[PDB]
Design a protein around this ligand. Structure first.
Ligand SMILES: c12c3c4c5c1c1c6c7c2c2c8c3c3c9c4c4c%10c5c5c1c1c6c6c%11c7c2c2c7c8c3c3c8c9c4c4c9c%10c5c5c1c1c6c6c%11c2c2c7c3c3c8c4c4c9c5c1c1c6c2c3c41
Ligand SMILES: c12c3c4c5c1c1c6c7c2c2c8c3c3c9c4c4c%10c5c5c1c1c6c6c%11c7c2c2c7c8c3c3c8c9c4c4c9c%10c5c5c1c1c6c6c%11c2c2c7c3c3c8c4c4c9c5c1c1c6c2c3c41
Lengths: 30, 30, 30, 30
């Protein structure tokens, strides 16, 4: 239901934040 | 540049995760 | 219970990520 | 420097949020 869908979406959103964060960390190392 | 865009995206992704989490939180107490 | 505690912790963790992200975004602007 | 430390902390915070979210996800299906 809504709660489950919300947590799945949240996890997906966090995954996207993480991959963008990794790109940014690499960019700073240069 | 890429680093700035990445952090902006990450912040937006986290905002999305937070609002879904708040929905889930309310659903639980419901 | 555990689910509620988990979501509260998760929200707190995300809040901490967000404030660190804001510091980083400011640092890049300089 | 500060920017690097901030992103490292943010990434660690998000990791923590994700593991709590996975616990919550399991609790729901339970
Ligand atoms: C990567 C960079 C590049 C690649 C990496 C991919 C992902 C992530 C990073 C990273 C940033 C990079 C670069 C940059 C390119 C490039 C590519 C690569 C892909 C990848 C995807 C993601 C992912 C995020 C990640 C951030 C992160 C930002 C970084 C930037 C730029 C920039 C730009 C490109 C471009 C493409 C495109 C891909 C697309 C993916 C996603 C998302 C999004 C993330 C963001 C965003 C930032 C931002 C932009 C664009 C842009 C968009 C788009 C795609 C999107 C999308 C997103 C963002 C866009 C935009
Ligand atoms: C701020 C910076 C500074 C202030 C801002 C505060 C918060 C956040 C940022 C930011 C980064 C900054 C600077 C830096 C100082 C400074 C201060 C300020 C405080 C604040 C707290 C948070 C918060 C995070 C934020 C990040 C972010 C990093 C940034 C860095 C350094 C650096 C450093 C200092 C120092 C203090 C200290 C405070 C403490 C808070 C938290 C957390 C943590 C966040 C992280 C971490 C990064 C990292 C370190 C330390 C360190 C620690 C500690 C405190 C901690 C803590 C954390 C991290 C430590 C560490």
């Amino acid at each position: 239901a809504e709660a489950e869908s919300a947590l799945e979406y949240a996890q997906q959103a966090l995954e996207k934040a993480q991959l963008a964060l990794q790109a940014a960390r690499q960019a700073l190392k240069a």
